[PDB]
Amino acid sequence: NLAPLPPHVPEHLVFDFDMYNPSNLSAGVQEAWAVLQESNVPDLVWTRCNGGHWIATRGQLIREAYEDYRHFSSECPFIPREAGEAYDFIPTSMDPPEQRQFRALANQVVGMPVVDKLENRIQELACSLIESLRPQGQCNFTEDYAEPFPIRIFMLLAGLPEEDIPHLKYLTDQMTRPDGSMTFAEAKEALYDYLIPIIEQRRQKPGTDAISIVANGQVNGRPITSDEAKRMCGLLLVGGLDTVVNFLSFSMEFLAKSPEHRQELIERPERIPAACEELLRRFSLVADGRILTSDYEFHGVQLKKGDQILLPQMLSGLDERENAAPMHVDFSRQKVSHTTFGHGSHLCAGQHLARREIIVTLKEWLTRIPDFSIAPGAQIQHKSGIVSGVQALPLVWDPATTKAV
């Protein structure tokens, strides 16, 4: 399924990478994307896959393009085109300065102060889930912890019932890792139809939850519309239900293979925040992009108005020009360079929430279950898309080596 090579794209810039099914997925998803950084591949290439689009392969280019919203607009930030065109989430499909006032509202509901507000529930839930698994001597990490821990905290934060998780999680995954089972537009509108009655209820009777706060905030000197509220809460749903979930899996899969890395963190827990950064770099997982607002020459390459460009947040930190021996996990790296939470004006608003969930996970897991591994003979499959992930992660351990606190 290769789209005909457009006339303005020279043949030597063609590299047919499929972001939804990279050829090297078996070696691990980050490894599969890292083929874009082998010496046979230019800094900036065109793939004919998924409609045809550019991909920046180097951190330097990815950062520049994320900064230059004048040429690289968030209007259409998803490949393929049909998805990016349907995509209307707020603030993510807006450029500055329009984006600005909506993002301040986002920061109000998922930013620092909400982390410190919710920190006790976060710690509480981590300990509770881990203690429940501890005596089993096994778990499916994706389903037993990676999903429920961040997702229940998000549902708590948004004041939504946990019974709604299965339905909302399915729709979220259709947008980031599409199955072909329903169009992006259909998935979005399914999520929108769920939010619509809730937002109306919470406009008429305001609560203190994230959804009440967004639905009742101010932009442009006036009340936010029911439509805008919907477009923002939609993004919060997606933001809350896929990235941390999948990132914890990558990290725990790594730690299952790395007894010496576990001991570093257990013996010197003050290194955990730096370790969090390193895992975020090494196991980075997001890849969206931008659309050209006009013809533009970028690093010697002629881009056309309306061209889509994938600017994989995943690749910046894997770039050997940014980090020596990028595939090696080194908690003492003097500088962990990455754009895992993105870059420029859209730099993730939930990044403080993400970090706290990661750091709490690292500490509390390794405290109670310091010695564990991947199930004997199990093959771990990764999946690739706008947000990449781990399909399943069966872990095992000897309960005699675990500890309650």
Restricted to residues 65-124, the positions that interact with K ion (CB under 5 A) are 87
Extract the tokens encoding 252: 């725990």
Angstrom distance (rounded) from CA 356 to CA 244: 10
Q: ∠ at Cα 395 (392, 398), nearest 5°?
A: 170
- Residue 158 interacting with ligand CAM (CB under 6 A): no
Q: Whole-number minimum distance, CB 398 to ligand HEM, in Å? A: 30
Q: Whole-number minimum distance, CB 298 to K ion, in Å? A: 14
Residue in 332, 361, 327 with CA at minimum distance from that of residue 150:
361
Restricted to residues 330-359, the positions that interact with ligand HEM (CB under 6 A) are 340-342, 346, 348-350, 353-354
What 3-state class would DSSP assign to 73?
strand
Extract the tokens encoding 222: 């006036």
Give the binding range for K ion (CB under 5 A) out of 33-41, 102-110, 150-158, 313-321: 33-41
Restricted to residues 20-79, the positions that interact with ligand HEM (CB under 6 A) are 74, 77
Binding letters toward ligand HEM, positions 285-304, x by CB under 6 A: xx-x----------------
Q: Are 363 and 123 in contact (CB under 8 A)?
A: no
Partner whose footprint covers residue 236, from ligand CYN, ligand CAM, ligand HEM, none (CB < 5 to 8 Å by kind) = ligand HEM
Q: Whole-number minimum distance, CB 350 to ligand CYN, in Å? A: 6
Beta-bridge partners for 104: none
- What burial class does residue 116 get, using C-beta atoms within 10 Å of its C-beta: 0-12 exposed, 13-18 middle, 19+ buried? exposed
Q: Which of 110, 187, 213, 229 binds ligand HEM (CB under 6 A)?
A: 110
Q: Which of 215, 387, 390, 395 binds ligand CAM (CB under 6 A)?
A: 387
DSSP 323: S
- Residue 316 interacting with K ion (CB under 5 A): no
What letters, b where the CB count within 10 A reaches 16 and e where it falls short, cover 220-234?
Answer: eeeebeeebbbbbbb
Name which of 52 and 239 has its Cβ closer to ligand CYN. Answer: 239
Give the binding range for ligand CAM (CB under 6 A) out of 109-117, 237-245, 332-340, 361-369: 237-245
Partner whose footprint covers residue 288, from K ion, ligand CYN, ligand CAM, none (CB < 5 to 8 Å by kind) = ligand CAM
- Residue 236 interacting with ligand HEM (CB under 6 A): yes
Q: What is the secondary structure of 274-313 as a DSSP string?
A: HHHHHHHHHT--B--EEEESS-EEETTEEEPTT-EEE--H
- Residue 350 interacting with ligand CYN (CB under 6 A): yes
Residue 204, Cβ neighbours under 10 Å: how many? 8
Extract the tokens encoding 169: 């999680």
Angstrom distance (rounded) from CA 341 to CA 286: 8
Partner whose footprint covers residue 87, from K ion, ligand HEM, ligand CYN, none (CB < 5 to 8 Å by kind) = K ion
Residue in 22, 13, 232 with CA at minimum distance from that of residue 107:
232
Segment (H or E) for 215: helix 210-215
Name which of 57 and 340 has its Cβ closer to K ion. Answer: 57
- Residue 115 interacting with ligand CYN (CB under 6 A): no
Residue in 14, 31, 34 with CA at minimum distance from that of residue 315:
34
Residue in 78, 76, 106 with CA at minimum distance from that of residue 90:
106
Q: Are strands 138-140 and 53-56 parallel, antiparallel or unpaired?
A: unpaired
Task: Tell me how far the alpha carbon of residue 31 is from its chain's centroid.
Answer: 17
Q: Whole-number minimum distance, CB 36 to ligand HEM, in Å? A: 17
Q: Is 139 annotated as a binding residue?
A: no
Partner whose footprint covers residue 249, from ligand HEM, ligand CAM, K ion, none (CB < 5 to 8 Å by kind) = none
- Residue 314 interacting with ligand HEM (CB under 6 A): no
Partner whose footprint covers residue 106, from ligand CAM, ligand HEM, K ion, none (CB < 5 to 8 Å by kind) = ligand HEM
Angstrom distance (rounded) from CA 177 to CA 288: 12
- Residue 247 interacting with ligand HEM (CB under 6 A): yes
Residue ranges of the annotated binding site for heme are 348
> Which spans of this chain sit near ligand HEM (rule: CB under 6 A)?
74, 77, 91-92, 99, 103, 106, 110, 235-236, 239-240, 243-244, 247, 285-286, 288, 313, 340-342, 346, 348-350, 353-354
> Which spans of this chain sit near K ion (rule: CB under 5 A)?
41, 57, 87
> Which spans of this chain sit near ligand CYN (rule: CB under 6 A)?
239, 243, 348, 350
